[PDB]
Structures are given as structure tokens and as C-alpha cells.
Amino acid sequence: GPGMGASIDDYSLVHKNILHSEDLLKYILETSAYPREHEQLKGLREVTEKHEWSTALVPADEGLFLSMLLKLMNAKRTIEIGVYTGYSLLTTALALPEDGKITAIDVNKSYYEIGLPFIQKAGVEHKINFIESEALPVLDQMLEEMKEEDLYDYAFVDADKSNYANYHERLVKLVRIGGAILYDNTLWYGSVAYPEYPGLHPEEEVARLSFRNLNTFLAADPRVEISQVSIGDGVTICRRLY
Amino acid sequence: GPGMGASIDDYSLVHKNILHSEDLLKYILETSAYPREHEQLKGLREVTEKHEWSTALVPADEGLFLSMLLKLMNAKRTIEIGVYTGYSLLTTALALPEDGKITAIDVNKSYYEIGLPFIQKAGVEHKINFIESEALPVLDQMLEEMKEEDLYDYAFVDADKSNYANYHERLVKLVRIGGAILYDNTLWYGSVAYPEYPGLHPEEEVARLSFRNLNTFLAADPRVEISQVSIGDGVTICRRLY
Ligand SMILES: Nc1ncnc2c1ncn2[C@@H]1O[C@H](CSCC[C@H](N)C(=O)O)[C@@H](O)[C@H]1O
Ligand SMILES: Nc1ncnc2c1ncn2[C@@H]1O[C@H](CSCC[C@H](N)C(=O)O)[C@@H](O)[C@H]1O
Ligand SMILES: [Mg+2]
Ligand SMILES: [Mg+2]
Numbered sequence: 413g414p415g416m417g418a419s420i421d422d423y424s425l426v427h428k429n430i431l432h433s434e435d436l437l438k439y440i441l442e443t444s445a446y447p448r449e450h451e452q453l454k455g456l457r458e459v460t461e462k463h464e465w466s467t468a469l470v471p472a473d474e475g476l477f478l479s480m481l482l483k484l485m486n487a488k489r490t491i492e493i494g495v496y497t498g499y500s501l502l503t504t505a506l507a508l509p510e511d512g513k514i515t516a517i518d519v520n521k522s523y524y525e526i527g528l529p530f531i532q533k534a535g536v537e538h539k540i541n542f543i544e545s546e547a548l549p550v551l552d553q554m555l556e557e558m559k560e561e562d563l564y565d566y567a568f569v570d571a572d573k574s575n576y577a578n579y580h581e582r583l584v585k586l587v588r589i590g591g592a593i594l595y596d597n598t599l600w601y602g603s604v605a606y607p608e609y610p611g612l613h614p615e616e617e618v619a620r621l622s623f624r625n626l627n628t629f630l631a632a633d634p635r636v637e638i639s640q641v642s643i644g645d646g647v648t649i650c651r652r653l654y
Numbered sequence: 655g656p657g658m659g660a661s662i663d664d665y666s667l668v669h670k671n672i673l674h675s676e677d678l679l680k681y682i683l684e685t686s687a688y689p690r691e692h693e694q695l696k697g698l699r700e701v702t703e704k705h706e707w708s709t710a711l712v713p714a715d716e717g718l719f720l721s722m723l724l725k726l727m728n729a730k731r732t733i734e735i736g737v738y739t740g741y742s743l744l745t746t747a748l749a750l751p752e753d754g755k756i757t758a759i760d761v762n763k764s765y766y767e768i769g770l771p772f773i774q775k776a777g778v779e780h781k782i783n784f785i786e787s788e789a790l791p792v793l794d795q796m797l798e799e800m801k802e803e804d805l806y807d808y809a810f811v812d813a814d815k816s817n818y819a820n821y822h823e824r825l826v827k828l829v830r831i832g833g834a835i836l837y838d839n840t841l842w843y844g845s846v847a848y849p850e851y852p853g854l855h856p857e858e859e860v861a862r863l864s865f866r867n868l869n870t871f872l873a874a875d876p877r878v879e880i881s882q883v884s885i886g887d888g889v890t891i892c893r894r895l896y
Contacts, residue, residue: 431884432674432844439847444882444890447873473882480881480891484727484834592726602674605681631689639722640686640715642673643883648686649722 413615414465414496415519415572423613425601426467430642445472450506453499456530460497463526470500470570470596474644478568478594481649482507485592487565492516493547493579494571494596498527504568505536514540515554515564517547518571547571551582563588570596573619576626584635584652591652593636598623599646655857656707656738657761657814664855667843668709672884679715687714692748694776695741698769702739705768710738712812712838716886717745720810720836723891724749727834729807734758735789735821736813736838740769746810747778757806758784759792760813789813793824805830812838815861818868822892826877831894835878840865841888 420426431437446454449472460469470478478500482490487508492501495518504514518524521544531537543550564587569579576595583593600616600623603609609620627648630638636650662668673679688696691714702711712720720742724732730751734743737760746756760766763786773779785792806829811821818837825835842858842865845851851862869890872880878892 430674430678432672433847436672436841436844436847440841440882440884443869444873444880448880473884476881477883477891480879480893481723481726483832483879483893484723484891486832590725590728599678599682602678605675605678627685631686637722637725638686638690639718640682641719641883641885642678642682642715643885649719649726651722651725 413572414468414523418613418615420464420467423467423616424611425603425616428601428603430599430602430645440473441471445476448476450502450534452530452534453502453506455533456497456499456502456527459526459530460499463497465496465523468496470503471644474647475499475503477641477643477647479503479507481592481594482566485565487512487592489513489562489564490515490566490568491564491586493567493569494518495542496523498524498531500568500570500596501540502527502531502534502536504566505531505539506534508539512539516540516542517545517550518542519544519546548575548578548582551579551586554586555582558586563591565591567591567593568596569594573597573600574622576622577629580626580630587652589652589654593650593652595626595630595648595650597645598627598640598648599642601645655815656710656765660855660857662706662709665709665858666854667845667858670843670845672841672844672887682715683713687718690718692744692776694772695744695748698739698741698744698772701768702741705739707738712742712745713886716889717741719883719885719889721745721749723834723836724808727807729754729834731755731804731806732757732808732810733806733828735809735811736760737784738765740766740773742810742812742838743782744769744773744776744778747773747781748776750781754781756782758782759787759789760784761786761788790817790820790824793821793828797824797827800828805833807833809833809835810838811836815839815842816857816864818864819871822868822872826894829894831896833894835892835894837868837872837890837892839887840869840882840890841884843887
């Protein structure tokens with residue numbers, strides 16, 4: 413994957429869309445996303461499109477959806493898990509107020525440095541505390557020091573696909589009651605729709621099975637309300653009830 | 655359409671899906687929507703599926719998305735434009751707090767009375783002020799009588815598909831700053847993706863062109879931020895800026 417393991421040349425699902433045609437996706441992006449995309453998000457996206465792991469990039473229509481959610485819920489303190497070149501992170505930082513704060517976590521700071529010049533030109537780096545680490549230890553350590561008054565409003569989870577369930581057990585305690593936890597890529601290119609799905613790299617199959625298990629679990633987890641949204645590669649929004 | 659004019663026999667787009675496969679939509683509904691769908695929403699949906707205008711029903715995964723937005727933005731006073739049998743209306747009434755208030759508007763009260771037993775059994779009918787009328791005169795009268803402190807938090811727009819642009823001009827004044835206006839069906843069965851589209855009957859084609867114009871207009875409208883979401887048949891979330 414992006415952070416470790418096999419390279420992109422052996423993956424299979426890279427170019428698969430969940431929408432019914434390339435034309436429909438292109439219509440959405442050209443009509444409703446690109447005209448509303450910040451100049452620095454455009455720049456970060458265009459440089460990322462040339463990178464070997466560009467398939468991992470959060471797309472422009474999903475980005476505006478994340479921004480909309482952040483603004484509607486008046487988020488101020490957030491956590492961003494799985495940064496890559498920083499498209500979703502820059503989206504969050506642009507949406508938050510001037511005194512908003514983001515804890516951003518990625519195992520690979522070199523990816524972050526691809527997009528960091530655009531984050532800086534947007535004038536929002538001051539909102540970001542970037543931590544280079546596997547996410548799980550950071551979440552474990554936040555749990556030990558987290559005060560109820562410091563709980564996050566919003567968490568975007570987009571790191572090791574096979575580890576979402578472990579992230580969830582920490583995050584339901586790190587976001588406030590009424591706060592949002594978003595799991596990215598929960599339809600896994602549409603491959604979750606079937607018990608079996610041939611032609612996958614072993615890492616893709618691990619992630620596919622993980623999402624099928626996670627989707628079933630979140631739908632029955634009494635601690636949250638959920639909405640799985642067929643935007644991008646699928647995004648499951650969770651809202652903490654207690 | 656459901657409110658006036660052509661019968662469903664004319665309509666050419668009813669069996670289209672914006673997602674790549676029926677199996678993926680079925681997966682979303684069975685895994686993430688139906689287990690979280692209120693029993694009275696299920697009953698209302700199942701009786702509506704047998705109705706002649708079933709194609710116009712808001713789907714269950716979109717419903718949970720509306721509920722999620724309502725709760726995340728802490729909405730308390732809303733307006734529902736285009737009720738039909740009441741699926742999105744019952745969704746809203748269940749999502750709002752006990753003292754939440756909905757102004758619901760539809761030209762056909764007989765559709766509303768199909769869903770009314772389920773709304774009553776859900777115990778949330780007290781939140782709903784139903785007005786049998788075309789929407790525009792009601793909205794215009796609201797603008798005459800509205801005060802700054804009675805602005806709506808949220809509007810769901812799902813009525814005459816050829817007239818959304820006229821609704822928008824009232825609703826950008828009726829919803830509070832920071833409030834949400836949602837336009838339903840903005841991808842119109844995917845048919846907006848092409849300038850010309852074959853074999854539609856006049857009403858479907860008028861609506862298709864209305865949505866192409868609307869999508870372009872909303873993307874350029876400085877009064878709002880937008881996010882067009884590929885859920886259901888397309889939902890465009892607008893957030894009032896000034
Ligand atoms: N165990 C782990 N802990 C933290 N980050 C991890 C991780 N395993 C993989 N990652 C990181 O997760 C990222 C997934 S791609 C994230 C995409 C990004 N959200 C966007 O907006 O485009 C990669 O950068 C990868 O380095
Ligand atoms: N001019 C108008 N003013 C108010 N309602 C109208 C209208 N023209 C059509 N309608 C109504 O708009 C509805 C569209 S279908 C609405 C679906 C509904 N929101 C759901 O949750 O499933 C129909 O009930 C129709 O009667
Ligand atoms: Mg992702
Ligand atoms: Mg509709």
C-alpha cells in the first residue's frame with residue numbers, strides 16, 4: 413500500500429469507478445467540483461495526480477463534501493488520519509475557522525512534503541500539528557491524555573485500510589458526543605458488494621474483507637448513528653451517541 | 655409528474671441508476687440502510703413502492719444521509735418542499751429534537767395521507783405543519799412575514815423539478831446564514847451528463863435541462879457554498895454565506 417507493502421503496479425482496483433460512467437463522474441467534477449476547488453487544492457491535486465499512488469487521492473467532489481460537513485457542524489478541532497499528499501487535510505484546514513486545530517497523522521512524512529508547499533501558500537499550516545507515525549500508537553497515547561473538554565469534533569479516517577476497526581475503538585472515545593467520525597473508501601471500489609471478488613492483490617483482498625466486516629459492524633454498533641454515502645469510493649459517516 | 659401533468663407511462667428514466675451496478679446499491683441498502691431504518695420508515699417505504707409514482711421516492715440510503723446532516727448541524731426548524739408519501743418528511747421529523755418544527759408543503763395532500771399513519775405511529779406528527787399548496791406562493795408569503803430570528807436551519811427541495819431555480823431565489827432568503835438548502839435529484843437519473851439525451855418525453859427533458867442549468871448556476875452562485883453528492887439520484891447541498 414501507500415504507507416508500506418506492495419507497489420501500485422501489482423494492484424488491480426485502481427481505475428475502477430463506482431458511478432455508472434466516466435462521463436457522469438466527469439460531469440460532476442467539471443460542473444460542481446473544480447469551479448469550487450481552492451487554487452491550492454487544485455495545485456496539490458495536479459501534482460499528486462502524477463505520483464505513483466495517485467489512486468489513493470481523495471477526489472475533488474468528496475473533498476467539497478467533507479468541507480460542507482465540517483462547516484455545517486461548526487467543527488473547530490479535528491484529527492486527520494492518513495494524510496498522503498494532504499488533499500483532505502488541506503480541505504479540512506481551509507474549512508475550519510482561523511483558530512481551528514488539526515492533528516494530522518501519517519506513517520510517511522515524505523508524502524506530506526509533496527503537498528505541504530500548497531498547504532503553506534493557502535496560509536493554513538499553522539492549524540496543523542503533523543505527527544509522523546503509525547496511527548494506532550498515537551491514538552492510544554491520545555486516549556491516555558485526552559480530557560473530555562478536548563475531544564475532537566471530527567475525525568477523518570483514511571490510513572491502513574485493514575486497521576479501521578482498531579481505529580474505531582479508539583476514535584469513539586476521542587471524538588465528542590455528537591462528533592463525527594468518517595471512514596474513507598468503505599465501498600472499496602465497489603468490490604465489497606460480493607462475498608468473493610477475483611483478480612485482487614492479496615493486500616486488496618485483505619482490505620476488501622476488512623471493509624465488509626467493518627461495514628457490518630458499524631451498522632450494528634449502538635455507540636454511533638451511521639450513514640454510508642456513495643461519494644468517491646464510499647464514505648461512512650458516524651456520529652457518536654454516547 | 656406526481657403533482658401535475660404527464661403520467662408515469664411516459665417516463666423513460668425510471669429504471670436507471672447512477673451507481674455502476676444494482677448489486678452495489680443493494681449492498682449499501684442491505685448492509686448500511688435497512689438495519690438503521692426506523693420501522694415506520696420501512697412501512698412507509700414498502701407501501702410507497704407499490705404506488706404509481708414510486709420512482710420519485712427518496713431512497714433509504716439517502717434518507718439516512720439527510721438524517722445525519724440534520725443531526726450534525728443541530729437543526730431545529732426546517733422546511734420540506736415536495737412531500738409525496740412522506741419518506742423524507744418522516745426522516746426529518748425523526749431526526750429533529752422533540753421541540754423541532756417542520757413546515758411541509760405539497761400540492762397533493764392525498765399522497766401525504768398515505769404516509770400519515772406511519773408518521774403518527776412514529777409519534778412525530780406534532781412536529782409537522784402540512785400545507786396543501788403549490789410551494790412558490792407559500793414561500794413568497796413566508797418572505798413577507800419572516801423575521802430574522804425565525805429563519806430556517808434546513809430546507810429540502812424536492813417538488814416541481816422544472817422550477818428549482820425559482821425555489822432557490824426564495825430559499826436563499828428563508829434559510830439562516832450557515833443554514834442548509836438541499837436540492838434533490840440533481841443528477842436526474844444520470845441524464846444531466848450530456849447536452850443532448852435521446853428519447854425522453856417532454857416533461858423529463860424539461861426537468862433534465864432545468865437541472866443542467868441549475869447545477870451550473872449553483873456552482874456560480876456567490877450566495878452559497880455547494881457540494882453535489884452522488885447519493886440517490888444526486889443531492890446538492892448548499893450552505894448560505896450571506
Ligand atoms: N499504519 C498507518 N498509520 C498511519 N498512516 C498510514 C498507515 N498505513 C498507511 N498510512 C498512510 O495512509 C495514507 C492513505 S492515502 C490517504 C489519502 C488522503 N486522505 C487524501 O486526502 O488524499 C498513506 O499516506 C499512507 O502512508
Ligand atoms: N408546484 C408544486 N408545489 C408543491 N409541491 C409540488 C409541486 N409540484 C409537484 N409537487 C409535489 O412534489 C412531490 C415530488 S416527489 C417528493 C418525494 C418525497 N420528498 C420523498 O421523500 O419521497 C410530489 O408529491 C408532488 O405532488
Ligand atoms: Mg482514502
Ligand atoms: Mg426527489
